[PDB]
Write a protein that binds this ligand. Structure first.
Ligand SMILES: CC(C)CCn1nc(-c2cccs2)c(O)c(C2=Nc3ccc(NS(C)(=O)=O)cc3S(=O)(=O)N2)c1=O
Length: 557
């Protein structure tokens, strides 16, 4: 069937949309080539609609069914709980889209009886009706990039009341099931450092390693009714409350499988017969389905000693090489199998024989050295999109602060330490907002973070070496430098100079601020300070951080 059917009604914005980089007095200090930075808007949604709209054919063989049977046997060991209304309410982000039924996210969060009473009526309807298609809103995402323009990605989501019900029924499932079913292959269980450790140990476990990323063209669109019904059969293997079982069945038939699409003006835009990008099960559904298809495809291609790492629609495989000719042929067969399973490639996969050249989750393993001179592996990425988004965030307040997320996830990197830390700590110092908690996203879920906690966060996630890495690789330094030239970002020597000032200003304020100066900016000074474990670091509750993925899933932790 067709992934989408369209009526011709446009995908409409809620409010005015900026596509051009906003500029203030701080912009030039970061980036001079403003015209290179843009945000996507609903006005390019037509282009996206064209790309995501196609027929899906699916041919399912014994490998597919064999892997599914294995997955189900593991799912059957999972026991999952129903969340209360109140528990589900507390998982709603403060900025989540308001209900069409007279209440918003903040009414959900502080648990007003209007919100709570509607939520109950939604739940009751789910239990009583397993057929009526549930309404969804289709919107265009506003995301920032550097020109290379990408059309807007689409987001499809049900009403706020339904989203809370999804959490009640499925939050425990989507949080616990994927690691049980997929074990070490489940990517969202890893911090960046643990991801590096897994990739490196896997690479080294092979006699002659080969790895590749597989890019599915428009993954959500390739997901079929079969796929979504199979995913439900996996959920239903769990030990569940009777009401959970019914709600999951109902959500599957009425929402997950497909449904009508409505724009922000209330017009019917058409119909979806593929994955909704804005449901709770988006991440877990995509992970299970990608893993199922890929595992079966590995068997079809007879890949030798293959290890998979899956994060939603993101796939990387490491296996034993048979030489370049046989590897290329193996991947073509793998790709043929994936295509039959309705997961055709965007760019055809290519075998890689250098781990540092494998890009997965937009990231790669690289190498630097700690204070002792000992090689340390760490995760990095091309800094282009992070810097483009930081530029937007320099002039505009955003609901999600990518700079803060990037500092957390990419703390050991050259570009995050020298540029992101320096730039944004300077901004926080000048406003005296160091103590003000900010929202960021990690694996799809929203977290409120105090920037003054960064040293403890970084020590806990990455270890003290993150504050002492040096002697980065020629490939990494060159990539950072090339990016700076492209965006017109000042050279790293300027950032070192600025950092010396930022560090001194932080130290002068004492307390947590001085700790930020000491640890985050020890790189900036000729004669360093001795870096010891921060006492307050053990106090932070970082449970729940790298448990599961929740992209589009409306989760606040
Ligand atoms: C450093 C780490 C270890 C690697 C790079 N990286 N970085 C980030 C962050 C960097 C700064 C702040 S979050 C991150 O949140 C993700 C990430 N991965 C995903 C991959 C694939 C999907 N596809 S789906 C829609 O679920 O089918 C969704 C996600 S996600 O939205 O959950 N986020 C990530 O992979």
């Amino acid at each position: 069937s067709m992934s989408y059917t369209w009526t011709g009604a446009l995908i409409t914005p809620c409010a005015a949309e900026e596509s051009k980089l906003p500029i203030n007095a701080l912009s030039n200090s970061l980036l001079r080539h403003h015209n290179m930075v843009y945000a996507t808007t609903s006005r390019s949604a037509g282009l996206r609609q064209k790309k995501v709209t196609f027929d899906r054919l699916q041919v399912l063989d014994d490998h597919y069914r064999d892997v599914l049977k294995e997955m189900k046997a593991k799912a059957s060991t999972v026991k999952a709980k129903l969340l209360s209304v109140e528990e589900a309410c507390k998982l709603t982000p403060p900025h989540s889209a308001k209900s069409k039924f007279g209440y918003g996210a903040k009414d959900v969060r502080n648990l007003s009886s209007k919100a709570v009473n509607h939520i109950h009526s939604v739940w009751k309807d789910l239990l009583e009706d397993t057929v009526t298609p549930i309404d969804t809103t289709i919107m265009a995402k506003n995301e920032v990039f550097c020109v290379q323009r990408k059309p807007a990605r689409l987001i499809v989501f049900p009403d706020l009341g339904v989203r809370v019900c999804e959490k009640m029924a499925l939050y425990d499932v989507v949080s616990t099931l994927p690691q049980v079913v997929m074990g070490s292959s489940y990517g969202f269980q890893y911090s960046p450092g643990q991801r590096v450790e897994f990739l490196v140990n896997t690479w080294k476990s092979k006699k002659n390693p080969m790895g590749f990323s597989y890019d599915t063209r428009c993954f959500d669109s390739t997901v079929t009714e079969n796929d979504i019904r199979v995913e439900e059969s996996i959920y239903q293997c769990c030990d569940l409350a009777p009401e959970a079982r019914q709600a999951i069945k109902s959500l599957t038939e009425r929402l997950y499988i497909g449904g009508p699409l409505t724009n922000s003006k209330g017009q019917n835009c058409g119909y979806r017969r593929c994955r909704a990008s804005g449901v709770l099960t988006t991440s877990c559904g995509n992970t299970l389905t990608c893993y199922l298809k890929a595992s079966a495809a590995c068997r079809a291609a007879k890949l030798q000693d293959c290890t998979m790492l899956v994060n939603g629609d993101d796939l990387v495989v490491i296996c034993e090489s048979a030489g370049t000719q046989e590897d290329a042929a193996s991947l073509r067969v793998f790709t043929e199998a994936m295509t039959r399973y309705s997961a055709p490639p965007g760019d055809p996969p290519q075998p890689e024989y250098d781990l540092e050249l494998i890009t997965s989750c937009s990231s790669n393993v690289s190498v630097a050295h700690d204070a002792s001179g000992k090689r340390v592996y760490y995760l990095t990425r091309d800094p282009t999109t992070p810097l483009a988004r930081a530029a937007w965030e320099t002039a505009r307040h955003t609901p999600v602060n990518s700079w803060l997320g990037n500092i957390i996830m990419y703390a050991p990197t050259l570009w995050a330490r020298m540029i992101l830390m320096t730039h944004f700590f300077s901004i926080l110092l000048a406003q005296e907002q160091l103590e003000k908690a900010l929202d960021c996203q990690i694996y799809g879920a929203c977290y409120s973070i105090e920037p003054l906690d960064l040293p403890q966060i970084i020590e806990r996630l990455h270890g003290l070496s993150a504050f002492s890495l040096h002697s980065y690789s020629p490939g990494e330094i060159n990539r950072v430098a090339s990016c700076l030239r492209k965006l017109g970002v000042p050279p790293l020597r300027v950032w070192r100079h600025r950092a010396r000032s930022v560090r001194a200003r932080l130290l002068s304020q004492g307390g947590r601020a001085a700790t930020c100066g000491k640890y985050l900016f020890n790189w900036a000074v000729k004669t360093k300070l001795k870096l010891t474990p921060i006492p307050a670091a053990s106090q932070l509750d970082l449970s729940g951080w790298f448990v599961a993925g929740y992209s589009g899933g409306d989760i606040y932790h």
